[PDB]
Amino acid sequence: NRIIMGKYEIEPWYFSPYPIELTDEDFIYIDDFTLQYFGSKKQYERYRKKCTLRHPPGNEIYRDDYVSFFEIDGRKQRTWCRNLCLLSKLFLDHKTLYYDVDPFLFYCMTRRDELGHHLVGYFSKEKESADGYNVACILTLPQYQRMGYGKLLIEFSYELSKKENKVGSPEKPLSDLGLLSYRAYWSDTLITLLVEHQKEITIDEISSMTSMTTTDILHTAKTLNILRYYKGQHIIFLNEDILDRYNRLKAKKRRTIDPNRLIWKPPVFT
Amino acid sequence: AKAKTRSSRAGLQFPVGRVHRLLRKGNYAERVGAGAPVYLAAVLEYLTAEILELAGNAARDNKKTRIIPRHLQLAVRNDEELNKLLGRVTIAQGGVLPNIQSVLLP
Amino acid sequence: SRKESYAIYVYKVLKQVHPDTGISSKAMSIMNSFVNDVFERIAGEASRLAHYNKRSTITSREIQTAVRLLLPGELAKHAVSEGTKAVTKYTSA
């Protein structure tokens, strides 16, 4: 029906396989740190009086003056990640809880406060992906959407892909919002690289410098008109619109991920 | 009523009539469909255009205005699909693609 | 004695694709041999296709199937596109 996460009462988007007793409740209470659900206000109050957790149950691998990043294993924190997946199904029609949370790593971005770190979004990641996906599921809370947070999450995902010395792509069945967000991110990164590079550059060099897959680069090039065939060859095409978009980008002065604040080493799984 | 070439009716440069005649006189079947020579001429024209385009690009890349067999060889052997199509064909005066094995280099 | 060839049509195509480029005689002979080769391959394959299905007429369908058999990937796709387009345009007028 409707859910109260922290101070924000949210209206769900899709079905989520919560206990039917919560589908029988008018209000659902969600802990802001443990993500525990409640139909009983008294149990919510008692839990808050006994809940001492004020940050994601994991190690902090990144922190700037605005947000911090936590790496959480689904196997180690099973209940918490199950809570996260249950909450995530509400906002994607396509999420699959047909499998438990063990083989998934969860990188959660939070904003710190006096009460603690407030989760605004995260992206999951398979411990061993056959397809080479660097993001499995990425959900950003609707009370924080359209704020550039998802852009920062994608930035952090590619920063991890660079720290893994790998290229990565999201799970290809992208949602419309996720597809548009990745279009924006790819376009902005490609334009920034092209303008700042100021030189002819190979595709493999772009993929190495951005950890973007070459397929993504090519599809964006087909959506854009960056690559043109002129005089028997394809060449960098510096048209007006590209520089105009680059100037609007420079004028917006959006938040960016600082790699030097990432104290993290890739996990080893047997 | 003046006559219009079947190539013009199909908007093609290759001779539809000659292809049809060669099909009839090639002992392939008792009967020949009307559209088969048109289809075959179109396919031949397309392949000719592809090869001539690649050869022209190679000739420009060698500062030449006249296509020579060397350009044809380079164009064919540099195209994966054309190379696969002509894997059992030898081009006279075609030469070889410049290719030096890494281990032989100092 | 008249000995026919494909030279003039190759020249027309070359003028349509590279109006400022010429061709040597030896290369024109090579192109003519290539055209004859492809023609023989496709006609033979079409003949076998007609025989397998116990047909006595070579239609456009057999040519299309032979092209799909002989040409790899995008070459086949574009050749089929060209053939269908040309046959349609011829059928129009």
Binding site: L218, A221, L227, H234 | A49, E53 | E74, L75, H78
Partner: peptide, 9 residues
Amino acid sequence: FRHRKISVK
């Protein structure tokens, strides 16, 4: 366009 190689390396 009629020809191949809409986008390659």
